[model samples]
Target: SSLLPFSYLYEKIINFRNTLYDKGFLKIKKLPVPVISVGNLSVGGSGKTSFVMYLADLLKDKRVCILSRGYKRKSKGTLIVSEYGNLKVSWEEAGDEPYLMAKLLPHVSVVASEDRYKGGLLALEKLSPEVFILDDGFQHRKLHRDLNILLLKKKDLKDRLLPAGNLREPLKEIRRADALVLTYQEVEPFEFFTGKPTFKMFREFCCLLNSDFEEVPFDILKEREVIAFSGLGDNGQFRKVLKNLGIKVKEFMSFPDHYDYSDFTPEEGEIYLTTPKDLIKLQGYENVFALNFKVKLEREEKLKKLIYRIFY
Candidate 1:
């Protein structure tokens, strides 16, 4: 049976890399503060950022700093999005997720870099945050984290590795995670499957924000026809929510992941809606709005226990 030759080879390579990290052939740097990572097994749209925001809220009283790889930002090297609770750079430089995080969590610091180790050093030098939330850092073996919170979707367990499918690692790689977060659904099946302490997460549309950054009513778009578009890891998720909410989506468009809409222009018609991550780049466009998804965690007490065990 032809089991997809590259998939087999890809799995071998991924396993070998994990072996190297496990055996200490690849060095994992430990930070001064406790590090908590929010990441997924798949390549895109796993609600990692929202989960990170949830953590930020949980640890708001503590001095927290978030470090990301800056994903697809044009800028190079370590860039500080926020320092001492002040935004230091634009989203174009710091990347969308980091910038959004800085804006939403004013008390927390956010930084981005391709080399997260260097980013961590910069955060220590500038913010001296008590804890670090490493966004999308599950497979990032170079930086050791105190708590590895891995987000998984039901679809992810049924998927295969990259080039053939969406998974970045095999399902068994989940064993490395300290805790499991089942996103966009319940936790029963995943909890039983992994035997890992699991939690549930669902994305809720919190509110609507206009181009001027003013909050609008959640039903601002109700009974109104509008075009919707996004460059997201999972564009379908956006469409799914819109349909679920009974929003009149006349037209829907999706671009590549982490697409930079620096020079984008919206069509002149009814208002348009997009993801908050995309809103950072499309803020200049008129008639454009963003749908903010707040991550709601279930079984909070268990998660709190896990968090306290690691940092406290």
Candidate 2:
């Protein structure tokens, strides 16, 4: 409640900035090909990463590339995480999400830059991708996107703006989205408010992967008492995912988002389970397993047709 006053001031500032863009004071850059953005209203944990991966999976046969801001990366300026079928940079250099995407989608190129427009141009000049999946790019109005995919969790819909709340923008700003993706649970109110094509999304834990990246059975942690931890924007969701799988979490730890495990020391006598994003940093640790999740969208065929229309 104490933060509400500051939130009100922040809201006014955002409104003015948005108005400047709406009135053409700011320029929006268009790319050569269609750009599909996967982003959210709040800070994190709305499943944007999984949806981007889903997009890459759907269009694997096509020449596709991902562009991210490379949040918390060590390097400066634009960096190409992958080129063609090879990863050219490490996670520490490219940031966790981009590195993970490069590793997972070997055929797809991944580039990270604070300036997405510059990064998109670099990808075009170098790899010539057919489509671009902009990661967390809704707020980046300077770069024109053919489709804006906004992910929203039910609990955040009622929350206030930042400083006092989780929302980066007001609920009314959702009108800017071309499509609405409701994660975890469906909220009919959003579909009515946005009047945009809405899709329901859910996460499923496929299996655990060992340090060697071999798929292990999901049952490995189903009945065992384990220590689960992650450095994610929404650490609570990680706990929920484990509980949904009927896994016994003896202890759950949370760290700052995109936390580097350079100084992390494992606790003895416990099996450590973490999200795949964190697994990149914990590769050398024994008894550590990555929880791999697959994102499923309802009415997937319709969504695919809508995206395909841009190319066809």
Candidate 3:
């Protein structure tokens, strides 16, 4: 990506909120109820969607609702998903992440709106959830959160801003994170990203798309000669992970991030495989099944027990 003529200016303007908040010019309202912020200082594809799903699964017994700004949703005041075991969402209506999260987590309610404060308030008004999970809520600083969990990937984070590089801010700013999640970890505690509680997430399994839900089976999609196609942030990671799992990847196709799924050409003897988040756009394509997958940090038992402490 080439730098826009005013790319530096854009960067400065996009990040001016941190300054305003620091100087007390803007008021960040912390909700009375608990808010767990799952976001990354880096751009999207930080495992936030899956992390939110994991949190939702953990808190299924407790009333949990997700508040998302609905990044790509066009016309939205507040769109809420039902808790009736399955959620109905339009790709164009609920942004990609919220739609994916809603699909993965059927029991939990999801709302899409730019005004997260109003979204949080609306979730409280409607669902009365004991806990509210914020998807990508760190950037939407209007509402403060109880726990701010930040996600980062080594391959994605070791760069500059887009057109220049891919950083949202300097690496130093991650000090503000309560807990740091290292997705696709290739190393141990690089000096720059250390000094915080860190966790690792590696791809765990492949899920077959069964209607609106992701159905999992180790033998169902394992070790098969399948062609992997993705428009995600990092395509290599998906390909490498699948290859490691003994899947015979006939071909690996990469597209630009959030690329509209228009020109899909699946080859012969190849089932189209993709990330669950990509399914929203790929719904129009034929013979395509998304891998509704999750990752596990090394000490996940301890981590799950820790999160349980926070909510319980």
Give each model's clash number: 0, 0, 4
RMSD of each: 3.1, 3.0, 4.2
Q: Report the number of the highest-TM-score candidate.
A: 2
- Candidates in order, TM-scores: namely 0.86, 0.87, 0.78
lDDT (Cα, 0-100) at 151 in candidate 2: 84
lDDT per residue for candidate 1 within 161-212, as digits (tens), equals 8778888888888889988888766332444367778787777777887655
Better of 1 and 2 by TM-score: 2
- Per-residue lDDT tens digits for candidate 3, residues 1-312, read 358545676577666867797677999887767788888776645667777777777777788887877764464676675553456656666667677767677677878787877887777776788788888877767888767788877765566765566676666557667787877653334323476667776656655674446574556565567767788657877877677667777878888885877776655554677776677676645566776566665776766665666653
Q: Rate the local accuracy (lDDT) of all candidates.
A: 0.79, 0.81, 0.70
Which residue window of length 10 is worst by lDDT in model 1?
A: 184-193
Candidate 2 TM-score, true structure as reference: 0.87
Model 2 agreement with the true structure over 34-126: per-residue lDDT tens digits: 899989989755778888878888897799988888875465668888986587877777877788777777678888888898898889998
Better of 1 and 3 by lDDT: 1
